Design a protein around this ligand. Structure first.
Ligand SMILES: CO[C@H](C[C@H](CCCCNCc1ccc(F)cc1)C(=O)NO)c1ccc(F)cc1
Ligand SMILES: [Zn+2]
Length: 512
């Protein structure tokens, strides 16, 4: 309508609802909009002096297991502990994170792994997104888990009034979004590197190609009137609700939408607003069940394809889509591309032999847009939260499963297929070790032979490869199967013993 007429009409529709909210209800909605942060002063006070000194000098961005949120908080914490010091110390501890980008020491690792338990904000919307609504996932303290459930049940009950049959087709709602919240990989290159006012057309095509549906597991907070973008908001969603979509009015002309929303992507276009290019995303709300049907149909389809390609029984459940968030369709469709690259770049007998071993152990290839600590193939086997990891990908020997987190980007990885191939490197290590001694099953990278190889060559490849024997093996494996011939040649030239060792293990596997 008129922008303000639309605002006043929606506010009127929800006025009784708004006036009727209890103090409890208003408090929940406030909490949801603005999460409570952990107390930095209290965290620091709880540390021993040695722990304080340890935290002062830790290279947080060298950790391999923290979420972005955990890292950013620890950085803010670190500023405070350092502030008693002085400028040289301050300036020094603070620019040999150049080539120094060393793996953390075991002492630094163990400290940070426990400390992360104490830095979680109480954030209902983040909890729903990280878990994809699987709020019983044992990735946070049980008592906090219970509070989240109570709050979420209560918010669900608050949001009982639908937008209705009168307004739904007379209004659009809006959401600005950082592309990095859907895909950090494409986000890195979305904007033209020489001219910030422009979108890279190739990356744009990649972004929209398989973007057909979207899920909100958390509560969307949408603008009644479109807000001009902040510098990092290059996505401008324009959303049409369904008559049955439940919502509540929020001050300053917003709506909070019910959680567990499905959205069909109707159109994706580059538009200009004030001499800058943005991506318009036109989306229509549909029942979430309609979207889940599409994901389940895709899961059946991709397994039917890959079971045949790999010579597995047709009914094998190998590939799983654990998909719950706003770039949903791309998580699904990109899995086909990732597996194609895997098959293209690795010998067929190797892929078949290793995958059969995984399947023999009820293993899965899990493609997901929820955080890895909330994937059962991890948490069923890492019962300590301090040992749970978020990362671009993981290999869990106990579940013989490869996990791949779609929305994030691995630092030294160009794409999702390189991450998957890295994890498959761990699977190779596992199966090769299993063959060595089927009775006491260990990784081949734990052999004295490879330990000696790592001690000699472990710094000769990637920075991340330095971490330990297993990561070195996986990194060497990935680089040996790169689409870039120069990278394959680098392993052969700079880590020749590792190159030989891996090829020898590949033969052992294929010949078993
Ligand atoms: C794809 O992601 C990796 C990093 C990622 C870091 C995870 C570290 C966890 N390792 C211990 C572990 C294992 C299984 C568990 F269940 C729990 C804990 C990884 O190495 N995956 O294999 C990556 C590799 C190369 C790169 F350049 C960037 C990231
Ligand atoms: Zn790894």
């Amino acid at each position: 309508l008129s922008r303000y007429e639309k605002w006043e009409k929606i506010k009127q529709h929800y006025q009784h609802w708004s006036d009727s909210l209890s103090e409890e209800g208003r408090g929940l909605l406030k909490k949801l909009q603005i999460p409570i942060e952990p107390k930095k002063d209290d965290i620091i006070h709880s540390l021993s002096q040695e722990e304080k000194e340890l935290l002062k000098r830790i290279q947080i961005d060298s950790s391999d297991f923290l979420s972005t949120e955990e890292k950013e908080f620890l950085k803010k914490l670190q500023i405070d502990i350092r502030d008693s010091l002085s400028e040289e110390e301050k300036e020094l501890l603070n620019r040999i994170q150049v080539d120094s980008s060393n793996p953390l020491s075991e002492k630094e690792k163990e400290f940070l792994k426990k400390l992360k338990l104490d830095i979680q904000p109480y954030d209902i919307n983040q909890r729903l997104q990280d878990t994809g609504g699987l709020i019983d996932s044992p990735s946070i303290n049980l008592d906090v888990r219970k509070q989240y459930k109570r709050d979420i049940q209560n918010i669900d009950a608050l949001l009982h009034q639908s937008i209705g049959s009168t307004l739904y087709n007379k209004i659009y709602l809006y959401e600005n979004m950082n592309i990095n919240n859907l895909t950090a990989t494409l986000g890195a290159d979305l904007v033209d590197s020489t001219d910030n006012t422009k979108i890279n057309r190739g990356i744009f095509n990649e972004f929209k190609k398989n973007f057909k549906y979207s899920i909100s597991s958390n509560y969307m907070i949408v603008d009644i009137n479109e807000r001009p973008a902040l510098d990092n908001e290059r996505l401008k969603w324009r959303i049409q609700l369904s008559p049955d979509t439940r919502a509540g009015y929020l001050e300053n002309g917003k709506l909070i939408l019910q959680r567990n929303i499905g959205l069909e992507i109707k159109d994706v276009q580059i538009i200009k607003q004030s001499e800058k290019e943005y991506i318009r995303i036109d989306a229509k709300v549909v029942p979430k069940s309609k979207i889940d049907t599409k994901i389940q149909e895709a899961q059946l389809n991709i397994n039917q394809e890959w079971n045949k390609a790999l010579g597995l029984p047709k009914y094998t459940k190998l590939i799983t889509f654990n998909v719950h968030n706003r770039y949903a369709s791309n998580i699904v469709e990109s899995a086909y591309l990732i597996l194609n690259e895997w098959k293209n770049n690795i010998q067929s007998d190797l892929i078949k032999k290793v995958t059969n071993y995984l399947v023999d152990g009820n293993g899965r290839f899990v493609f997901t847009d929820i955080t890895l600590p909330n994937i059962a193939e991890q948490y069923t086997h890492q019962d300590e939260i301090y040992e749970q990891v978020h990362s671009k990908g993981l290999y869990v020997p106990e579940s013989r499963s490869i996990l791949l987190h779609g929305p994030s980007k691995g630092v030294e990885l160009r794409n999702d297929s390189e991450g998957f191939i890295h994890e498959f490197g761990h699977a190779v290590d596992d199966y090769a070790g299993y063959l060595l001694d089927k009775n006491q099953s260990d990784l081949v990278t734990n052999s004295k032979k490879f330990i000696d190889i790592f001690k000699e060559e472990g710094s000769n490849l990637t920075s991340y490869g330095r971490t330990n024997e297993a990561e070195f093996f996986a990194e060497a494996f990935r680089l040996m199967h790169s689409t870039d011939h120069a990278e394959r040649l680098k392993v052969q030239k700079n880590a020749p013993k590792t190159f030989q060792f891996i090829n020898d293990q590949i033969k052992f596997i294929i010949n078993s």
